[PDB]
Paper text:
The largest of these factors, eIF3, is a multi-subunit complex consisting of five stoichiometric subunits in yeast (eIF3a, b, c, g and i). One of its large subunits, eIF3b, serves as a scaffold within eIF3 as it interacts with several other subunits. Here, by using X-ray crystallography we studied the structure of yeast eIF3b-RRM and showed that it corresponds to the canonical RNA recognition motif.
Two different truncations of the N-terminal domain of yeast eIF3b were designed based on homology to the published structure of its human ortholog. The second construct encompassing residues 76–170 was designed to have an extra helix according to the secondary structure predictions. Crystallographic phases were obtained by molecular replacement using the structure of the sex-lethal RRM domain as search model. The last β-strand is followed by a short α-helix which connects this domain to the rest of the protein. The two yeast eIF3b76–170 monomers occupying the asymmetric unit are related by a two-fold non-crystallographic symmetry axis, forming a closely packed dimer. Two monomers in the asymmetric unit are held in place by interactions between their β-sheets and between each β-sheet and the extended α-helix of the neighboring chain. Interestingly, comparison of the dimer of eIF3b-RRM with hnRNP A1 (UP1) shows that Tyr 158, Asp 162 and Phe166 of one monomer interact with the RNP1 motif of the second monomer in the crystal, mimicking the presence of the oligonucleotide. Comparison of the relative orientation of the monomers between eIF3b-RRM76–170 and eIF3b-RRM76–161 showed that chain B in eIF3b-RRM76–161 has been displaced by ∼9 Å relative to the same chain in eIF3b-RRM76–170. Therefore this dimer is most probably an artifact of the crystallization and not the functional unit of the protein in the solution.
Numbering used by the authors: 71 to 169
The structure:
Amino acid sequence: GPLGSDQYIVVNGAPVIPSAKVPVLKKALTSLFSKAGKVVNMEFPIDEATGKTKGFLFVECGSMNDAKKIIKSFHGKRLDLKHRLFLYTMKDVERYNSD
């Protein structure tokens, strides 16, 4: 994305659902994460064959500090009784792709 590398987060462990349901999940996760920091955009990779989410997503935050606060608040926490989320800064993954 076009913002600073350390403003992006990868979230793992989210629901695997028909992607018809992404807008609902997106607003739910955006609403939750917004309690800790500013979310600018959120994107869910989809398995083309099944049309399902893959269970991870990439989040663009309003600043490095917003990303850090989101990771701190949500990393390792249960989303519900079936899912637990794991959040990391995306910078090294971005650079592994581009270095």
